[PDB]
Amino acid sequence: TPTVMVVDESRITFLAVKNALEKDGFNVIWAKNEQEAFTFLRREKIDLVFVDVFEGEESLNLIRRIREEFPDTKVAVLSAYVDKDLIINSVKAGAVDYILKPFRLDYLLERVKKIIS
């Protein structure tokens, strides 16, 4: 079963993602920070990581770091904030998708399905 990791300070973001993917053949895990995210990436296979974007280039640096250290792990952005430059820079950093919060559970599920082979 493919594993999806939600990197967000909010447990609720994790709950919503789990609600969308759980009964659809996906194992969802939660990392409240970058430190914790890397602890998991190093110990297990993680197919997709959702990163919360909004603050400076550090959010972009996390995307880059994940992509470089774990090339087999795809990264998608999940955020409430959305402007042209956030989208452009996150994809430049290596993100494969950019999904807005609040999201429809069925929309998230279909975007995830397109990302994970």
Next chain:
Amino acid sequence: LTPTVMVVDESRITFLAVKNALEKDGFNVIWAKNEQEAFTFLRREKIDLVFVDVFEGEESLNLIRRIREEFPDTKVAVLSAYVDKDLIINSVKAGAVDYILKPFRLDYLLERVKKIISS
């Protein structure tokens, strides 16, 4: 240094707008009304930046990728009448480094272009 900027767009109005926004600031702006004309130019002179109108959809994305593969030192930015999250994502994935809505402000285009030229 005077960078060359090529506008690939059927619209002469768009070409003129880009020219007016960049000419006086040290940019050499040229016009290609279509893909064929764009490559005739690319095969003859080095182009620093190309603006591609993404109207034809996947054909436009196909063009961005072809320019990037054949002329890797050439930067590509999109000009579009519509802004869409997915269009933006796919454009950047194809190799575009910016996405600008048209009609655009002259000062805004100049600043974005300078930003693209720097790095």
